RNA sequence: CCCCCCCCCCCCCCCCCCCCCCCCCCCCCCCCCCCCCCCCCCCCCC
């Protein structure tokens, strides 16, 4: 029963409440216990409780005396119990409750008036019960109740009389999910004082019943209406007629298996702002299908279209000018679809668009012709996502229409070509370009000469070729900050590749082959490709096969903080190498061949750190080579994980395995 | 000028012969020098010479006084000189010479009688000279001359008169290669006393001139006749008519670009025993093409047939019963051909065949149907070679016709299947089966149950699968001696896999993954799969990833001599492991992680060796761990290559790199 | 001045083989999570 300010007793197998706790405890948690009964006589000591979570237990019934001992209780949680009987005196003395959870209590019928005696209630939960009617009392009560949950019940109708108790209550959420509701009575929602949101997820309504619901929702204050998994196979221009008289803003139609969308179906939602259509089975989107939605600010179409079938090749076709109506659209999530391709008028009319996602949106967008993004000429796009589209070639002037583009995501594709440099023309405001996980890229002298504003360039596992050109391909990128060149099997790097990139901060070169470039036997001398990077912060050089470190590689990294050198073949290091790393924070040298840690090399590096990773190193336990290191280990504040588990000497055999 | 019994002065840039050598020297070699002249006055000291190789020098002329100082000279070599003038007195005093080389001396014309004064000459060489006629004198001499070489000369005719000097000489070899001979005179070869072999390689004869040659060779004692690269495009039944009256045994027709072979072409060679046809362009072999060769004991057909061409797909077709005439054939080398496949009557009639080679003989022999080798039912084959035939499947009873087969070579193929065990039925006398470098093989319990007589089984780089069956697939192979299982990436081995193989001698398991089977943390205990191999001699366990050696793995290898354990991860070894290796000869532990060599483990192993390979090991220079080893290195007779080059300690840094 | 034969030496090209390092893929084994399922035991409600 650990407790400092709140009390936790979760999964402690308690049968009776403890009697030894501070009197001024505010939260008392007893989830996942076996409390058969809860006598109130044991709550005399606990008279300052605010939250009482006694859920997931086996309480049969409660007593009104429990509330007497708690004068200021605000939360009462009784999830997954056997409290199937309620009375007027059950919640009589409790009047400050702002939360009441009764989920999965097997409550069958609300008898007379269990909730009359409280007026400050905010949230009421009745999910997973055996209730058949939404009647919670006779007179009007629950003045401040804002959220009412009735999901997973056995309610088959919504009669007008049963909601007469909410004539003056502002319901912000009426959860009625998973209830086989098949009849709606007139005035059922008009009787509710102020209904702001309705949720009918997993409710088998159907199109005709959906139209009846919308008609019953006319001239009300609804703002949200979730109809997920409602088996809404087909919509028409009259399905949402009843919403013409309201101001609905959020509509959810996900998982409805919507086979087709009718012409002018959504013309009755001029105030819609958030529209959801993910995980549907739409086979054809008409030009006027999305008519009347000129105020939508966020449209989701993830898996909204039909998948390809070898039987018929029923690829979902999107007609031209289909998105011309979404004037105020600002976010289009359109991932995991099977569209044949982009047309010249597919995205016409989106004059306020700022985010377009096309991750795996097309079956085969092999070539990015310069006319592909012509429909996005007037769209002020900022972020474009094109991952997993199996793109194989990008022609010149492909992105010449996206003048406002800032983030381009071309990773996880099959782009194999030579970057002539003309592919990035027109990206005058580009900031980040992602190209990782491609087939193979061949850089040129002027590959990135047309995008001087670039700041991020990720090229992880792309099999870079001709990166060792005499003019550095990264020279025009004066504002570059993050560069990733990992898992490219790079062999040769020139010393002037990173020349002029003063603002570079994060550089990744792990999982490459640069061992030869740093050995003293390399013809032409070791390559010092890390000079001038005065603002470098994070350096990664894992699995490079390094066997020797030149003395003056880190001579100018005055602001280096994180350096990674694990999975290398380092055995000895030059003396006085980390002198300029005055602000180093994390040093990683795991899975190396280092046998000696001396002050002459690791002195300045161990000045003020916060992490250290030298786990799988064959240390040599000798006072000449490890004594300073173990003495430093003894007194320090640096975090060294697995210090006593893997920091084991290998030689001499006398100290073989001794930490 | 190193010399103990013979004198060598090759490539020493001598200008004059040395005057300080033992008097009783028998061989005096001066090849590749710059001896402008060779005065005989310097040979007074050297009067016991038998061989005098002064070739590849710049001697202009010699003097008869040179022979006077040498009474017993037998070899006179003058290759690549400028001795273009010969006289009767040049070789007068020299009479014991049994060898005389005059290659590339730019000799223009033999004037009168340069070789009369000797009668014991055996071999005479005159290659790469400017001679235009084969006249070497006027009268008859050279009684004992057996070999005469005249290759690469400028002889354009073979007149009868020019060979009148060999009326009583037995010529075993008359080399006339690379001479543009275009006319043969009657009686040219009949004038020669006893001609046994003629060589006309690289001589542009042609079919009509070949027939004229054969007619001129009638009723003579020739036995060999090499006509390689003679531009013999076509043969007919009359090309070799002139050989009907002789007893020719060896005939060479290689590189002749023989496009077609005529019907009954070789019916005139009943005594032929060695026939060569390699590197030809035969497009079709007729049934009666090889008629009359019922005495051939060795036929070579390597690249004898035309290669495939995409223009016409002119695959060389071999008619049925084409080899029916070779009754006494015993060796058929038939590699590197483009035959479409094997037929039911391709090899019929070979009742004495004992060696058939079909390495890369067919373009695509994908499936080995049980009817493929039906033509070899009565052939007493012993060795069959089927490498690089791109064989993809072997059906049951494929080798049911080869009852006398002993060696089967199926390696370097693409055989991917499951060895049900019925493929080896009928191999009652099989000894060796080669299957290395295949696609993938899946062994079964009774894979080799039908060939208990097997002794060799090579399975290198075949990706063995299901080798860890509960019954050992090698159990029926009671007489197995050599087993190769390298580069198969084998993971799991049962301890009874090699049970009962007492006669096993050589076992290869390198380049596999058996590290887990020997660690003490392996569930079920370490696998001791080397028990009962009392006759094991060679063991290979390279690149297995071993990290720990069980103590009693080599407890029964009483006759082990060569053990390989290089490229492993061994760091420590159990004490008293090599006790039973009383006859160990070579121990290989290179490229390991061993840091300590102690008498407790390497004592018995270093008893009496002949080789040791521990080059790339990070030894720990400490008197507790290396002192015994270095003391043993000091005094020993074992061969330790690169002892002072790679046996360098890694730790402590004081001894870093010191041998 | 031309045509050739040798000695020595330095580059260049092709192929074979070996070694170091690395990448990708795959196999074997282990571990950490997530979901689902089955069984045993205890405690309650109807
Ligand atoms: C363009 O769209 C694509 C696709 O939507 C975006 O890719 C997404 O990028 C984010 C950020 O990198 C990814 O989130 C990551 O999720 C991984 C999940 O790994 C988990 O690891 C735990 C470990 O226990 C496992 O148990 C889990 O099962 C799981 O494997 C997480 O490790 C990362 O830290 C990170 O949060 C996201 O997954 C990825 N989407 C897809 C489909 O791959 C891309 O960012 C976007 N471009 C832009 C510019 O926004
Ligand atoms: C069925 O026929 C096949 C094909 O004729 C036979 O395969 C032959 O097998 C022999 C013996 O294994 C091979 O000889 C080997 O040749 C290699 C050559 O390697 C060399 O290495 C030097 C190293 O400096 C290089 O310079 C050279 O260039 C060359 O690469 C040699 O290393 C071995 O020691 C061995 O002598 C032969 O090459 C091989 N033939 C072919 C075409 O691969 C096969 O034996 C035969 N089956 C039976 C049962 O006879
Ligand atoms: C939906 O929104 C419209 C526009 O905001 C509301 O119409 C206004 O309502 C307010 C409050 O009753 C009136 O003061 C305005 O005069 C109305 N303007 C117009 C042009 O009608 C409408 O009431 C909202 N719907 C509901 C059900 O409240
Ligand atoms: C109607 O739905 C919208 C969209 O789900 C809700 O807006 C989000 O609400 C969640 C829950 O409070 C927040 O976490 C998000 O930040 C909201 N998004 C935005 C863009 O504001 C909205 O609250 C719902 N309205 C009602 C009355 O339930
Ligand atoms: C919704 O509007 C679109 C746009 O007009 C309709 O598409 C037309 O369908 C007819 C009938 O096949 C075609 O002849 C026209 O060529 C289509 N128009 C265009 C621009 O291609 C669509 O039919 C309408 N929906 C319904 C249900 O009628
Ligand atoms: C690289 O970044 C710098 C700094 O963000 C950019 O310089 C700014 O340019 C704008 C517009 O010309 C000026 O208003 C700012 O005053 C500049 N900042 C400074 C500190 O001088 C520069 O334009 C960027 N380079 C590119 C090619 O976009
Ligand atoms: C080729 O071989 C045959 C058979 O060996 C030779 O014929 C024999 O020659 C010897 C020697 O002259 C005689 O004694 C035999 O009587 C011959 N027998 C027959 C059946 O003819 C023949 O001479 C050989 N060819 C040459 C050119 O010598
Ligand atoms: C005729 O040719 C055959 C085949 O080349 C010769 O027999 C081989 O001769 C070489 C050279 O002496 C030997 O190394 C081989 O061992 C011989 N092979 C066999 C099977 O004996 C034969 O010597 C040649 N005959 C003449 C007279 O030159
Ligand atoms: C050499 O003998 C073979 C075997 O008879 C001849 O092959 C025959 O060729 C004729 C003409 O095309 C065909 O009609 C026969 O069917 C072939 N025989 C067989 C058994 O297939 C071959 O023609 C002869 N060589 C020459 C030059 O005539
Ligand atoms: C395995 O090898 C042994 C020895 O070579 C074979 O035993 C010989 O068999 C022959 C024929 O039956 C006998 O004449 C020998 O006396 C046997 N030798 C010994 C030492 O007993 C045995 O047959 C071979 N196994 C197979 C299946 O062929
Ligand atoms: C509750 O309902 C009564 C009767 O309609 C009404 O007078 C009162 O204003 C309502 N409560 C609130 C807080 O509006
Ligand atoms: C559906 O469209 C038709 C065609 O204009 C129209 O007559 C009808 O009124 C629409 N449905 C509703 C419910 O308005
Ligand atoms: C680039 O776009 C223009 C305008 O559509 C077009 O005329 C031209 O052919 C395109 N270039 C290429 C290489 O396709
Ligand atoms: C060194 O690290 C400690 C611990 O995080 C921190 O308190 C101190 O300020 C650091 N010193 C400097 C100069 O940053
Ligand atoms: C350092 O050593 C002292 C003396 O043994 C010990 O008291 C102290 O706990 C050690 N510090 C750490 C972090 O272990
Ligand atoms: C040399 O030729 C003569 C004349 O024909 C002959 O008598 C003599 O026997 C021959 N020499 C030998 C060794 O046969
Ligand atoms: C070639 O064959 C024909 C047909 O039998 C025959 O008449 C002729 O004699 C043969 N040639 C020779 C040189 O015998
Ligand atoms: C095996 O050979 C016999 C005889 O030619 C044939 O009848 C049978 O079909 C062959 N078996 C298979 C599986 O082809
Ligand atoms: C040990 O090796 C030496 C050297 O080869 C050899 O002379 C000697 O006979 C060997 N001893 C035995 C018992 O084989
Ligand atoms: C062994 O050491 C002795 C003493 O230094 C030396 O004379 C002898 O040459 C050494 N043996 C070898 C094989 O180097």
Author numbering:
A (entry chain B), B (entry chain A): 29 to 687
Paper text:
Toll-like Receptor 3 (TLR3) plays a key role in anti-viral defenses by inducing a potent immune response against double-stranded RNAs (dsRNAs) produced by viral infection. The charge interaction with the phosphate backbone of the RNA double helix plays the principal role in the interaction. The ligand-binding site involves both the N and C-terminal parts of the TLR3 ectodomain.
To determine whether the transmembrane and intracellular domains are necessary for the linear clustering of TLR3, we produced the ectodomain of TLR3 (ectoTLR3) and determined its structure in complex with poly(I:C) dsRNA. To study the cooperativity of the clustering, we titrated the ratio of ectoTLR3 molecules against the number of available binding sites in the poly(I:C). In the subsequent 2D classification analysis, the number of the TLR3 particles in the cluster was estimated to be 50% of those in the dimeric state. In a close inspection of the micrographs, we found that almost all of the particles bound to the straight double-helical part of the dsRNA are in the clustered state. The vast majority of TLR3 not in the clustered state is located either where the TLR3 clusters ended or where the RNA strands make irregular kinks. This observation demonstrates that clustering is a dominant feature for TLR3 when bound to RNAs with regular double-helical structures.
